[PDB]
Design an enzyme around this catalytic site. Structure first.
Site, mmCIF file in Angstrom:
data_model
loop_
_atom_site.group_PDB
_atom_site.id
_atom_site.type_symbol
_atom_site.label_atom_id
_atom_site.label_comp_id
_atom_site.label_asym_id
_atom_site.label_seq_id
_atom_site.Cartn_x
_atom_site.Cartn_y
_atom_site.Cartn_z
ATOM 1 N N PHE A 1 -7.164 -8.339 -11.122
ATOM 2 C CA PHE A 1 -7.866 -9.043 -12.212
ATOM 3 C C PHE A 1 -6.519 -10.047 -12.473
ATOM 4 C CE2 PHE A 1 -8.890 -4.619 -12.722
ATOM 5 C CZ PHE A 1 -9.890 -5.158 -13.358
ATOM 6 N N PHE B 1 -8.173 7.206 -12.300
ATOM 7 C CA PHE B 1 -8.993 6.036 -11.202
ATOM 8 C C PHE B 1 -8.201 5.968 -10.114
ATOM 9 C CE2 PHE B 1 -6.185 3.533 -14.040
ATOM 10 C CZ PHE B 1 -5.451 2.726 -13.853
ATOM 11 N N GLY B 2 -6.844 5.632 -10.420
ATOM 12 C CA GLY B 2 -5.471 5.529 -9.098
ATOM 13 C C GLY B 2 -4.702 4.889 -8.976
ATOM 14 N N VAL C 1 -2.724 1.098 -10.199
ATOM 15 C CA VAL C 1 -2.253 -1.632 -10.903
ATOM 16 C C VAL C 1 -0.982 -1.196 -10.339
ATOM 17 C CG1 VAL C 1 -2.502 -2.448 -12.843
ATOM 18 C CG2 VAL C 1 -3.413 -0.331 -12.518
ATOM 19 N N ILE D 1 3.141 -1.051 -11.552
ATOM 20 C CA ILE D 1 2.969 -0.796 -12.903
ATOM 21 C C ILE D 1 2.121 0.139 -14.013
ATOM 22 C CG2 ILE D 1 3.884 -3.525 -13.376
ATOM 23 C CD1 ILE D 1 0.619 -4.282 -13.369
ATOM 24 N N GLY D 2 1.269 0.535 -13.990
ATOM 25 C CA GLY D 2 0.556 1.824 -14.416
ATOM 26 C C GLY D 2 -0.192 2.802 -13.199
ATOM 27 N N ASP E 1 -14.336 3.531 -24.437
ATOM 28 C CA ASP E 1 -12.529 4.151 -24.506
ATOM 29 C C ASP E 1 -11.469 2.656 -25.078
ATOM 30 O OD1 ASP E 1 -10.705 5.646 -24.620
ATOM 31 O OD2 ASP E 1 -11.245 6.151 -22.065
HETATM 32 N N1 B7W Z 1 3.533 -4.552 -17.214
HETATM 33 C C1 B7W Z 1 1.892 -3.718 -17.967
HETATM 34 C C2 B7W Z 1 1.761 -2.479 -18.893
HETATM 35 C C3 B7W Z 1 0.634 -1.731 -19.221
HETATM 36 C C4 B7W Z 1 -0.326 -2.948 -18.990
HETATM 37 C C5 B7W Z 1 -0.880 -4.369 -17.561
HETATM 38 C C6 B7W Z 1 -1.780 -4.348 -17.488
HETATM 39 C C7 B7W Z 1 -1.538 -6.044 -17.205
HETATM 40 N N2 B7W Z 1 -2.914 -6.812 -16.770
HETATM 41 C C8 B7W Z 1 -3.429 -5.766 -16.180
HETATM 42 N N3 B7W Z 1 -4.789 -6.235 -15.761
HETATM 43 C C9 B7W Z 1 -5.673 -5.801 -15.858
HETATM 44 C C10 B7W Z 1 -5.006 -4.624 -15.596
HETATM 45 C C11 B7W Z 1 -5.544 -2.937 -15.824
HETATM 46 C C12 B7W Z 1 -5.749 -2.105 -16.790
HETATM 47 C C13 B7W Z 1 -5.817 -0.716 -16.578
HETATM 48 C C14 B7W Z 1 -6.377 -0.549 -15.640
HETATM 49 N N4 B7W Z 1 -6.497 -1.110 -14.562
HETATM 50 C C15 B7W Z 1 -6.672 -2.463 -15.334
HETATM 51 C C16 B7W Z 1 -4.124 -4.799 -16.164
HETATM 52 C C17 B7W Z 1 -2.688 -4.040 -17.078
HETATM 53 C C18 B7W Z 1 1.034 -3.817 -17.636
#
Ligand code: B7W
Length: 344
Positions: free
Chosen positions: A105, A37-38, A40, A32-33, A154
């Site tokens: 998370f 860092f890598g 998600v 999803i992202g 940030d």
């Molecule tokens: N679909 C979508 C779009 C943008 C962010 C997320 C999302 C939803 N839950 C999240 N919990 C932790 C993160 C997150 C965000 C940035 C870097 N690593 C984890 C995280 C990201 C999910």
């Protein structure tokens, strides 16, 4: 050819396979992202039985190290944060899978950059902007508890998520480039659009930098577009000076990078430096008119809607101007922010 027994690619990132189960526990839905860092992913946890977002860190020492700092800082916040009531995204656990630090998370709805985009960059209710501000003020207040003293470094729409897609309860993410209060290690910090004057000028920064960011963030959530959208640091500063005026002399006299954007005239004062290739004069695009407190809100489109009176817009200009204070020591802090007449 094949790196880490063919689990990793050229960028040291774990290649995601939708459906792959890990450790007789996590069931990977999709990616999803991604980031520096890598990556998600989206993944169901069978032990607790919920959806979780697992931050996959790149199999490389530099990324493993800073992810390890972030894991320290999050765990540390979970010691204070007991009843998940200070609007930080919860780190649940962390483990090693195939030589990657994985952070589990709590799973969340789209970020505020998606919310802005869903209105085609024309913002949302003042009513909602107040809810998000209150919630973000307390989160900051919590970060400023002395034991923590954590600077996010940030904050942008990109790093603030919604809990429910049908509810206004938010959380903050991305503590990977976030330090504690202390002697100055970095100078090039924050996303440019949301970078404070103390940083641009290269002076001692403390917890007030996140308050500047929020200040820029709230206006954007109501207007749709960034308050200061600079191409480079020279444009950014100028665009701040379009709105807030030239900064005070005593701050510019101290600033190491004050000659990147200004010149000191023969008579004591500071002036702007002309540029390569048309701004407005200092402090002449006033926030009053940016927000449109007498003209039915941002580009007229809130005229007539409940809770968008001159009375209500003036409270929101006052707090926003109080957050965007050029001076990091008189700038407003979260405990006084919540007291402000805007949350009443
Ligand atoms: N679909 C979508 C779009 C943008 C962010 C997320 C999302 C939803 N839950 C999240 N919990 C932790 C993160 C997150 C965000 C940035 C870097 N690593 C984890 C995280 C990201 C999910």
């Amino acid at each position: 050819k094949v790196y880490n027994d063919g689990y990793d690619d050229d960028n040291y990132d774990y290649i995601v396979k939708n459906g792959e189960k890990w450790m007789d526990r996590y069931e990977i839905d999709s990616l999803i992202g991604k980031g520096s860092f890598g990556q998600v992913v989206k993944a169901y946890d069978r032990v607790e039985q919920e959806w979780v977002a697992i931050k996959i860190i790149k199999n490389k020492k530099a990324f493993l190290n800073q992810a390890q700092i972030e894991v320290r800082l999050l765990e540390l916040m979970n010691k204070h944060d007991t009843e998940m009531k200070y609007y930080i995204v919860h780190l649940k656990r962390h483990f090693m899978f195939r030589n990657h630090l994985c952070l589990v998370f709590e799973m969340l709805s789209y970020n505020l950059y998606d919310l802005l985009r869903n209105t085609n960059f024309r913002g949302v209710s003042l009513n909602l902007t107040r809810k998000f501000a209150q919630q973000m003020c307390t989160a900051l207040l919590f970060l400023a508890t002395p034991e923590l003293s954590i600077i996010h470094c940030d904050l942008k729409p990109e790093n603030i998520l919604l809990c429910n897609p049908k509810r206004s309860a938010i959380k903050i993410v991305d503590f990977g480039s976030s330090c504690q209060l202390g002697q100055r290690i970095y100078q090039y910090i924050q996303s440019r659009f949301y970078r404070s004057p103390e940083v641009l000028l290269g002076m001692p920064y403390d917890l007030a930098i996140d308050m500047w960011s929020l200040g820029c963030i709230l206006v954007e959530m109501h207007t749709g577009e960034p308050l200061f959208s600079g191409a480079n640091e020279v444009d950014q500063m100028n665009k701040i000076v379009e709105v807030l005026g030239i900064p005070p002399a005593h701050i510019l006299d101290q600033a190491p990078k004050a000659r990147k954007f200004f010149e000191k005239l023969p008579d004591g004062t500071w002036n702007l430096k002309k540029t390569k290739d048309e701004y407005k004069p200092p402090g002449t695009r006033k926030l009053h008119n940016i927000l449109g407190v007498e003209t039915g809100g941002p580009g007229g489109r809130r005229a007539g809607e409940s809770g968008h009176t001159v009375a209500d817009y003036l409270k929101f200009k006052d707090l926003i101007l109080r957050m965007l204070d050029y001076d990091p020591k008189t700038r407003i802090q979260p405990y006084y922010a919540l007291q402000h007449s805007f949350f009443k």
